[PDB]
C-alpha cells in the first residue's frame, strides 16, 4: 500500500472533505457578523478538549476562511485549505506561491487552539515570528483570542490599541462593510473604509513568558522555544509559568525544521576562576600561532593540528618539552585554541557590531545572536584575537530541537518541501508524511541552469554585468549570497560600477523592515543573505512584473538541495511569474573542499582551455551529486548526537522531573536522610567490612565533615544495619529539627539547596557527558557500533551522579 | 498445468521480495545496527511478506498432496 | 633474534582478559541449552506433523 | 529467578524463528536433507546445504562484498558514508549476491537431481527440475533472506544460521549416528568445552585508545573545549581478528584436497591428516594476518590523529601521525601472533588429544566454532538490553 497509490488516494480523501466544506462556505455568505461572533462562542464551547472534534473542522474552517475574507482577503486557494486539513493530520501541504502558508496555518491553528492548551507554531526567525503574528492577527480578534509570540529577550502579542480602537471595530463588527461584489479569487485593492479601520489591527504590547504561552496561539522560533523549554530549570519558583506544557506544533518552512541538526543548548553561568589568566594568557596564546605559517592543515571539518613546523613551534615556544602529551596537553590546548580561532572561523563571521565591540556570532543560518558562544574556548580565543576579552565559559543544558523536543510530545505538520530527502526523515523521527499540492497556476515561474565559470569568484564579476543588463531593462533584481563578507564586496561591486541598491545582510534589523516592501519596487536592486531569502510573503508594487516579473541571482549552491531551491523560491507569491539563475565557480566553496578531488581529474583532464560559459560535460551534473553528497555528511553527523541525545532524553527526564517534584512537595525529610544513610551506610558495608580499622578508615574518607559524631569512637561490633542506621539517623533527624530552630522559612532552604545542588551536579556531569561522546568516537573499532558503550556509560554516570547528589546536598543542609 | 504457470509466478514472488529489502533499507544495512524505534508497525509491504510464506506452504499441498 | 623478538614482546603483551569470563562460560552453556532446547522442540512438534502431513 | 523476565523481544523472535525453519526445510522440490571429507561435506560443488540455496547464498552474499571490497577498495562510487554511501553500497550488495545465488542454483540442481542417495526424485522432466530447483533456490533464498532481516530486527541476521547449527549440533548428541566407535569416553565433550573458553579469549583483543572531543554539522559551524573533570571512564580502540577464522582457511585447504582425490581418473595419493600441520599453519598466516591487516583498517591513525588524538595505552602515549600506526603496527602483528596460538590450537585441539586413540569422526570442531560464534554475538544482544534503570534503584 505504498506508491502514488498513497499520494493520489490522499487526493480524493481531501477532494471529498473539501467538496463538503466548500458547500459550507457557500450558504454562509449571509453577512454573518454578530451571528459569526456567536459562532466564535459556539465553537468555543463545542470542543474544550482534544477529542478531535472532526465535524467542527468543517464548519469551523469555513468560518476561518470567511473570517479572513471579512478582516483581510487572501484565502481562496486550496493547498492551504487542504493544507490545514493535512496540517491537522501531521505531514506537509504546500510548496510555495499563492498557496497560503500565512492564512493556511491560521486555519488549523484555530481549531486546535480551541482546546485552551495553547498551540505551537515554529518559524525560523524573530522577524518572521512577528510576520505571521500580525499577517493573520485580524481574524483572531475577530474570533476573540489572544495571539502570543516570543523573541530573543522580549515578547509581545496583541490586537488593536487601548480602548478607542476596540470601540472602533466593535460596532464595525455589526457593520463590517464588505460582503458584496464577491464570487472570485480576484481579491483586488479596495474597501478602504474597512482596511483603514480594521487593517490597523496590527499592533503589539509588552508582556512576559507566562501569559504569553498560556494565551491562545504561541508564535515563535525553535531557537527560542527550545530555550524557553529549558528556561524551566533553575526555577527556584514553579510559579514561573515558563511555558505551559509542550505538545502540538505546525512548522512554517519545515524544510528547515529538520536541518536544525546542532542541538539546542542554553548556556550561561560561567564562573571562570581563571579569568584574569585567560586575559593575559590568551593574549600570548593567539600571538603564538600568529608566529606560525599556513601549513597547519585546516579543512573538511573544524578540527586542526600541524606536522613538522607544528611540533617545531610547540617546542619553539614556551615548552622545550618535545613530548608534550604527558598530561601536559593543557598547554597544547592553548595553541590549538588560537590556532582554530584565527582560522576555523573568520572573525568576520563572528562580527563586531558598530563599535559595540562585542564579538557576536551571526553564523549558523541565523541573523545576529547577541552575547553567546557555541563553546568554552572559541569565544575567548577570538576575543584574544580582537580586543575586549570576556571571561565566560559555561554550559547548563542541551536537547534535540526536534525528536527530543517535538517527539517529547505531540505532533507536527510542515509547510513547503517535497523532495524524498524529507520523507525518510519525517519517518525516522517526526513520524509524518507529504501532501504535495500545486495551488492555482503551478510553478508559473521560469528558471535557468547552473551557469558555471572557472578559476576564482571571477564569475561573481560576470554576474555583476548581469545585474546590470537586467537593471537597464528595468528589472527588479535580488541576489542570495552566502556570507557577510562576500555580501559586502557584492555591494562594493555595484558601487564601483555605479548601481543603487540596499543590503539586508544582518547589517541592521530596521533594514529588514524597510526592505520588506522596499525589496523589488520596479527596477529596484537588492542584495541579501540566505538568512532573509528563505520564505517570505514578498510582493511587488506597480506594473513591476511588466517583463519577467522578478529576477533572482544566486551567488552559489548551499549545503542542501532544498535550501538552494529556497533562496530561489523567494521569487513567487500569490501565484505570479519570475526568473531565477545560478552562477557557480569551480573555485567557489561548495566544491572548493567538497568533491574537489573528483571535479579535479574530471575537469583538468576533460578540458581546461576555454572562455567562461560552460556546463556541457558533466558540470551541473557532477556538482549535483556533490551537493546531495555533502547533505549526506550532515545526515551522518545528524545521527551521532541524535541517537546519543535520545538516551539523554531519558536521563534528563528523571533529572528535572525530580527537581520538579522537590520544588512542589515539602518535607522529604525522612526520605533524604534515609536514602542518604542507606547509601552511605551500605558504603560502610560495600567496599569496607564493618570490622574496625577497615571501616573507621575507609568510612572516614566517607565521612569527612568538620562536624563531630563518633569520629574517633571505635570498638563497636553491633552493626546489623539496623543499629548503624539509627545511630547516624538520629544525629541527623534530631539535629535536623533541632537545627530547624531557625524558623518556618527553613522550608525554602532545601529549595535553593536541592535544585541548585542537583542542577549543579547534573550540568557538571554533563560536561563529562561530552567527554563520553569521545568514548563513542571509539566504539567505531572493536565492539559493535550502535551507541553501545555510550548507553552503558550514560547510566554508569547516571547512578554515580545521583549518589553524589545525596552526599553534598546533605551536608549543605547544615553549615549555616 | 498449475505448476508450470504458477512456477513463472513463484519467480514473480521473488521479485517483489528481492526489492522489499533493496528499498527496505532506511534503517537496515547488511550488518548495520539500528534499533531505531519511533518507526515500524507492520509495513504496508508486509502483504508481500504474507504472500511469500503463504506461497511456499502453498507449493506444499500442490506439489505432493 | 627475529621470532624471538615477536615472542619476547608478546609474553608481556598478553592482556585484555576477563577473570570472570567463567561467568560468560556458564552463560555459554545456558545459551547451548537454548539450542538443544529449540531443536528438541522440533522433534516433538515436527513429529506431530510427521503423522499428519507425513504418513498420510 | 535467573531469567528475570522483561525481554519483550526474546521469546518473540525465538519462537517465530522455529516456525519459519520448519516449513523451510521440508520444502517441496528440494529439501535435499530431511574422499571421506567430500562424502561427509555433501553437495554438487562444495556447499553443505540443509536446504537448496538459502544459507549458501547467505555465506555467498557475505563473501561477495567480503573479498570484493577487500582486495578492491573503491572502484565504483561507494566506500563508507555512515548512511548515504552505506545504503548505496548495501543495495549493490543485494542485487550482487542475488544473481550469484543464481549461478550456484542451476549447477547444484543438476548434479544433485541425478546422482545422490535416498533419491525418490521423479523423472517427469517438463520444467527441468533445474528450473524448478532454480525456483525453490532463488525464491528459497528470499524466504530465508526476508526472514533474516526480520530476525535481524530482534535477534540477528545470523540468528537464522545459529538455528541451523543449533539443529545440527543437536542431532548428533542425541545419538543419531555416533555410537559405532568410541562412546562411554565422553571426555571429548568436556574437552570441546575447553575450546569454548579459548574462543571467548579472542574477543577482548587488545581493546585500548587516546583523547579529545568534537562534533561538526550544518554548514560552517562547530566548537571546542578545555579541561577540569572528575570521573571514571577512559579511551578504547585496538582490536583482533573477527569472525569465521579457521573455518574460512580450513575450507580452502579442503579444496586442493578434493581435486587431488578426483583429478584425472582419480590420482589417488595422500593428503588427509599427514600434511595437516602444514595446512594448519596456513590457517594462521591466511586468516589472522590478511584479515587483521585490512581489518584494523590501515587508515585508523588518519582519522584519530586527525580529530586531534595522542593515544594513551599500556603507558602514557604520545607521538601522533602515522608514527602512531607504527607503535600500533607492533601491537597489531604481535597480538595477532598470540591470536594464532589460540584459534589454530582449536583445530589442533582434537589433533593434540587424538594421538593415542584417534577418531575418524571429527564432526564437531568447525560447526561448533560457528554455533558458538553466533552464541557469543547474541550475548551482545543481551549485553546491551541488560541494565534496566540504575537510577533511584537504591538512591533518591
Ligand atoms: N488566498 C489568497 N488570496 C490572495 N492572496 C493570497 C492568497 N494566498 C496567498 N496569497 C498571496 O501569496 C503570498 C504568499 O502567500 P503565503 O501564504 O505567505 O505562502 P508562501 O510562504 O509560499 O509565500 C501572499 O503574501 C499573498 O500575496
Ligand atoms: F510563510 Be511562507 F512559507 F514564506
Ligand atoms: Mg507562510
From the helix content, strand content and strand pairing of chain B, which structural class follows? mainly alpha
Q: Major sheet of chain C, described briefly?
A: none
Characterize the main sheet of chain B.
Answer: none
Supply the number of helical segments of chain B.
Answer: 2
What's the tally of helices of chain C? 2
Largest binding interface between chains: A-D, 86 and 63 residues
Number of strands of chain B: 0
**What share of the residues of chain B does DSSP label as strand, in percent?**
under 5%
PDB class: membrane protein, protein transport
Keywords: protein translocation, membrane protein, ATPase, ATP-binding, Inner membrane, Nucleotide-binding, Protein transport, Transport, Transmembrane
Assembly: tetrameric
Entry title: Crystal structure of the protein-translocation complex formed by the SecY channel and the SecA ATPase
Question: Please, could you describe this protein's structure?
Answer:
Chain A: It catalyses: ATP + H2O + cellular proteinSide 1 = ADP + phosphate + cellular proteinSide 2. The complex is a heterotetramer of chains A (816), B (65), C (56) and D (396). Chain B has helices at 2-22, 46-63. With 65 residues, chain B is mainly α. In chain B, helix 1 runs antiparallel to helix 2 (46-63). Chain B is elongated, with a radius of gyration of 15 Å. Chain D has 396 residues and is an all-alpha fold. Chain D folds into 2 domains: 1-181, Preprotein translocase SecY subunit; 184-215 and 230-359, no CATH class. Chain D is built from 12 helices and no strands. Residues 101-102, 252-253, 415-416, 535-537 of chain A line the site of beryllium trifluoride ion.
Briefly say what this structure is:
The complex is a heterotetramer of chains A (816), B (65), C (56) and D (396). Chain A is an alpha/beta fold.
Question: Secondary structure elements and their pairing?
Answer:
The complex is a heterotetramer of chains A (816), B (65), C (56) and D (396).
Chain A (H helix, E strand, L loop, with lengths): L3 H23 L7 H11 L9 H18 L9 H9 L2 E2 L7 H13 L5 E5 L2 H10 L1 H6 L6 E2 L4 E2 L9 H10 L16 H7 L7 E2 L1 H6 L2 E5 H10 L17 E4 L1 H4 L8 E2 L7 H16 L17 H9 L12 H16 L33 H8 L10 E2 L14 E4 L4 H11 L15 E8 L4 H15 L4 E5 L2 H13 L5 E3 L4 H10 L6 E5 L21 E4 L6 H9 L9 E7 L10 H9 L14 H46 L4 H15 L9 H10 L19 H18 L7 H29 L12 H25 L4
Parallel strand pairs in A: 1-10, 2-6, 2-7, 7-10, 11-16, 12-14, 12-15, 13-14, 15-16
Antiparallel strand pairs in A: 3-4, 4-5, 8-9
Helix pairs in contact in A: 1-3, 1-4, 3-5, 4-5, 13-15, 13-16, 15-16, 23-27, 23-28, 24-26, 24-28, 27-28
Chain B lengths: L1 H21 L23 H18 L2
Chain C lengths: L1 H12 L7 H35 L1
Amino acid at each position: 500500500m505504498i506508491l502514488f497509490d498513497k499520494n493520489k488516494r490522499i487526493l480524493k480523501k481531501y477532494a471529498k472533505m473539501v467538496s463538503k466544506i466548500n458547500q459550507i462556505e457557500s450558504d454562509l455568505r449571509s453577512k454573518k457578523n454578530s451571528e459569526l461572533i456567536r459562532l466564535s462562542m459556539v465553537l468555543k464551547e463545542k470542543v474544550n478538549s482534544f477529542e478531535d472534534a472532526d465535524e467542527h473542522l468543517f464548519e469551523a474552517f469555513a468560518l476561518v476562511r470567511e473570517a479572513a475574507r471579512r478582516t483581510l482577503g487572501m484565502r481562496p486557494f486550496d493547498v492551504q485549505v487542504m493544507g490545514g486539513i493535512a496540517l491537522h493530520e501531521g505531514k506537509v501541504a504546500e510548496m510555495k506561491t499563492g498557496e497560503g502558508k500565512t492564512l493556511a496555518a491560521t486555519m488549523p491553528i484555530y481549531l486546535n487552539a480551541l482546546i485552551g492548551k495553547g498551540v505551537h507554531l515554529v518559524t525560523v526567525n524573530d522577524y518572521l515570528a512577528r510576520r505571521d503574528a500580525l499577517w493573520m492577527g485580524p481574524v483572531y480578534l475577530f474570533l476573540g483570542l489572544r495571539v502570543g509570540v516570543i523573541n530573543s529577550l522580549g515578547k509581545s502579542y496583541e490586537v488593536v490599541w487601548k480602548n478607542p480602537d476596540l470601540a472602533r471595530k466593535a460596532i464595525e463588527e455589526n457593520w463590517s462593510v464588505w460582503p458584496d461584489g464577491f464570487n472570485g479569487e480576484v481579491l483586488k485593492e479596495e474597501s478602504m473604509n474597512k482596511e483603514a479601520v480594521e487593517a490597523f489591527q496590527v499592533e503589539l504590547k509588552e508582556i512576559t513568558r507566562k501569559e504569553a504561552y498560556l494565551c491562545d496561539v504561541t508564535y515563535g522560533t525553535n531557537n527560542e522555544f527550545g530555550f524557553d523549554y529549558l528556561r524551566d530549570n533553575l526555577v527556584l519558583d514553579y510559579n514561573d509559568k515558563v511555558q505551559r506544557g509542550h505538545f502540538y506544533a505546525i512548522v512554517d518552512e519545515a524544510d528547515s525544521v529538520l536541518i536544525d541538526e546542532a542541538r539546542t543548548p542554553l548556556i550561561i553561568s560561567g564562573p571562570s576562576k581563571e579569568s584574569p589568566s585567560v586575559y593575559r594568557r590568551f593574549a600570548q596564546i593567539a600571538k603564538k600561532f600568529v608566529k606560525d605559517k599556513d601549513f597547519t592543515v585546516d579543512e573538511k571539518a573544524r578540527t586542526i593540528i600541524l606536522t613538522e613546523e607544528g611540533v617545531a613551534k610547540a617546542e619553539k615556544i614556551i615548552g622545550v618539552e618535545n613530548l608534550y602529551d604527558p598530561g601536559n596537553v593543557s598547554l597544547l590546548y592553548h595553541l590549538i585554541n588560537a590556532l582554530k580561532a584565527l582560522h576555523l572561523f573568520k572573525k568576520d563571521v563572528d562580527y563586531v557590531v558598530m563599535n559595540g565591540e562585542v564579538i557576536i556570532v551571526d553564523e549558523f543560518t541565523g541573523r545576529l545572536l547577541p552575547g553567546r558562544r557555541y563553546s568554552g574556548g572559541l569565544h575567548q580565543a577570538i576575543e584574544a584575537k580582537e580586543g575586549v576579552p570576556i571571561k565566560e565559559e559555561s554550559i547548563t543544558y542541551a536537547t534535540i530541537t526536534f525528536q527530543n523536543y517535538f517527539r517529547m510530545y505531540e505532533k507536527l505538520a510542515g509547510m513547503t518541501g517535497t523532495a524524498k530527502t524529507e520523507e525518510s526523515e519525517f519517518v525516522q523521527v517526526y513520524g509524518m508524511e507529504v501532501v504535495v499540492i500545486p495551488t492555482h497556476k503551478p510553478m508559473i515561474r521560469k528558471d535557468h541552469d547552473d551557469l558555471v565559470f572557472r578559476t576564482q569568484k571571477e564569475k561573481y564579476e560576470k554576474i555583476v554585468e548581469e545585474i546590470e543588463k537586467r537593471y537597464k531593462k528595468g528589472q527588479p533584481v535580488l541576489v542570495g549570497t552566502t556570507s557577510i563578507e562576500k555580501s559586502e564586496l557584492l555591494s562594493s561591486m555595484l558601487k564601483k560600477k555605479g548601481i543603487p541598491h540596499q543590503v539586508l545582510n544582518a547589517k541592521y534589523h530596521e533594514k529588514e523592515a524597510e526592505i520588506v516592501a522596499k525589496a523589488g519596487q520596479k527596477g529596484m536592486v537588492t542584495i541579501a543573505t540566505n538568512m532573509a531569502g528563505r520564505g517570505t510573503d514578498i510582493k511587488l508594487g506597480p506594473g513591476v512584473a511588466e517583463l519577467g516579473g522578478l529576477c533572482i541571482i544566486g551567488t552559489e549552491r548551499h549545503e542542501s538541495r532544498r535550501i538552494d531551491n529556497q533562496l530561489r523560491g523567494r521569487a513567487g507569491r500569490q501565484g505570479d511569474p519570475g526568473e531565477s539563475i545560478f552562477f557557480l565557480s569551480l573555485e567557489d566553496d561548495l566544491l572548493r573542499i567538497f568533491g574537489s578531488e573528483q571535479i579535479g581529474k574530471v575537469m583538468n583532464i576533460l578540458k581546461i582551455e576555454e572562455g567562461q560559459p560552460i556546463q556541457h560535460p558533466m558540470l551541473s551534473k557532477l556538482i549535483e551529486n556533490i551537493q546531495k553528497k555533502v547533505e549526506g555528511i550532515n545526515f551522518s553527523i545528524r545521527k551521532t548526537l541524535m541517537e546519543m541525545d535520545d538516551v539523554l532524553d531519558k536521563q534528563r527526564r528523571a533529572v528535572y522531573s525530580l527537581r520538579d517534584q522537590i520544588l512542589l512537595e515539602k518535607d522529604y525529610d525522612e526520605y533524604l536522610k534515609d536514602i542518604f544513610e542507606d547509601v552511605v551506610s551500605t558504603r560502610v558495608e560495600e567496599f569496607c567490612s564493618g570490622k574496625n580499622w577497615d571501616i573507621e578508615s575507609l568510612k572516614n574518607s566517607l565521612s569527612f565533615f568538620p562536624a563531630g559524631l563518633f569520629d574517633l569512637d571505635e570498638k563497636q561490633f553491633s552493626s546489623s544495619e539496623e543499629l548503624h542506621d539509627y545511630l547516624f539517623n538520629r544525629l541527623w533527624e534530631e539535629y535536623q529539627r533541632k537545627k530547624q530552630e531557625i524558623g518556618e522559612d527553613y522550608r525554602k532552604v532545601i529549595r535553593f539547596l536541592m535544585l541548585r545542588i542537583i542542577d549543579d551536579h547534573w550540568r557538571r556531569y554533563l560536561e563529562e557527558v561530552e567527554h563520553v561522546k569521545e568514548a563513542v568516537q571509539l566504539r567505531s573499532y572493536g565492539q559493535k557500533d550502535p551507541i553501545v558503550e555510550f548507553k552503558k556509560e550514560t547510566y554508569y554516570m547516571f547512578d554515580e551522579m545521583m549518589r553524589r547528589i545525596n552526599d553534598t546536598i546533605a551536608n549543605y543542609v547544615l553549615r549555616v | 498445468h498449475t505448476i508450470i504457470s504458477v512456477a513463472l509466478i513463484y519467480m514473480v514472488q521473488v521479485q517483489m521480495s528481492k526489492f522489499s529489502e533493496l528499498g527496505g533499507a532506511f534503517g537496515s544495512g547488511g550488518l548495520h545496527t539500528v534499533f531505531g524505534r519511533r518507526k515500524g508497525l507492520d509495513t504496508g509491504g508486509k502483504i508481500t511478506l504474507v504472500l511469500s510464506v503463504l506461497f511456499f506452504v502453498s507449493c506444499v499441498v500442490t506439489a505432493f498432496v | 633474534e627475529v621470532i624471538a623478538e615477536a615472542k619476547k614482546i608478546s609474553w608481556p603483551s598478553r592482556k585484555e582478559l576477563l577473570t570472570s569470563f567463567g561467568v560468560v562460560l556458564v552463560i555459554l552453556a545456558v545459551t547451548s541449552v537454548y539450542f538443544f532446547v529449540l531443536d528438541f522442540i522440533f522433534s516433538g512438534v515436527v513429529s506431530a506433523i510427521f503423522k499428519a502431513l507425513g504418513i498420510g | 529467578a535467573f531469567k528475570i523476565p522483561e525481554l519483550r523481544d526474546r521469546i518473540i523472535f525465538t519462537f517465530l524463528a522455529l516456525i519459519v525453519f520448519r516449513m523451510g526445510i521440508y520444502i517441496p522440490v528440494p529439501g535435499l536433507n530431511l574422499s571421506f571429507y567430500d562424502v561427509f561435506t555433501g553437495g554438487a560443488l562444495s556447499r553443505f546445504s540443509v536446504f537448496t540455496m538459502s544459507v549458501t547464498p547467505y555465506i555467498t552474499a557475505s563473501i561477495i562484498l567480503q573479498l570484493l571490497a577487500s582486495v578492491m577498495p573503491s572502484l565504483k562510487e561507494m566506500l563508507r558514508e555512515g548512511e548515504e554511501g552505506r545504503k548505496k553500497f548495501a543495495k549493490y550488495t543485494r542485487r550482487l549476491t542475488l544473481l550469484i545465488g543464481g549461478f550456484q542454483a542451476f549447477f547444484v540442481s543438476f548434479s544433485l537431481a541425478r546422482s545422490n542417495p535416498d533419491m525418490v526424485a521423479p523423472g517427469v522432466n517438463v520444467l527441468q527440475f533445474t528450473v524448478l530447483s532454480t525456483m525453490s533456490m532463488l525464491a528459497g533464498t528470499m524466504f530465508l533472506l526476508w526472514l533474516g532481516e526480520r530476525i535481524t530486527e530482534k535477534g540477528i541476521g545470523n540468528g537464522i544460521s545459529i538455528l541451523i547449527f543449533a539443529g545440527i549440533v543437536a542431532r548428533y548428541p542425541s545419538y543419531i549416528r555416533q555410537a559405532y566407535l568410541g562412546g562411554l569416553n565422553l571426555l571429548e565433550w568436556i574437552f570441546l568445552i575447553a575450546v569454548a573458553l579459548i574462543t571467548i579469549f579472542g574477543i577482548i583483543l587488545v581493546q585500548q585508545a587516546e583523547r579529545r572531543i568534537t562534533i561538526q554539522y550544518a554548514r560552517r559551524v562547530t566548537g571546542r573545549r578545555v579541561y577540569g573533570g572528575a570521573s571514571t571512564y577512559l579511551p578504547i580502540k585496538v582490536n583482533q581478528g573477527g569472525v569465521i577464522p579457521i573455518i574460512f582457511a580450513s575450507a580452502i585447504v579442503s579444496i586442493p584436497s578434493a581435486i587431488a582425490s578426483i583429478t584425472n581418473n582419480e590420482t589417488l595419493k595422500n593428503l588427509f591428516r599427514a600434511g595437516g600441520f602444514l595446512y594448519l599453519l596456513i590457517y594462521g598466516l591466511l586468516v589472522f594476518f590478511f584479515t587483521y591487516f585490512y581489518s584494523v583498517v590501515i587508515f585508523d591513525p588518519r582519522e584519530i590523529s586527525e580529530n586531534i588524538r595522542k593515544y594513551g595505552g599500556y603507558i602514557p602515549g604520545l607521538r601522533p601521525g602515522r608514527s602512531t600506526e607504527q607503535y600500533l603496527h607492533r601491537v597489531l602483528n604481535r597480538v595477532t601472533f598470540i591470536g594464532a596460538v589460540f584459534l589454530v590450537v582449536i583445530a589442533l585441539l582434537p589433533y593434540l588429544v587424538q594421538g593415542a586413540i584417534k577418531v575418524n569422526v571429527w564432526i564437531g570442531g568447525t560447526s561448533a566454532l560457528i554455533a558458538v560464534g553466533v552464541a557469543l554475538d547474541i550475548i551482545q544482544q543481551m549485553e546491551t538490553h541488560m541494565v534496566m534503570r540504575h537510577y533511584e534503584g537504591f538512591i533518591k
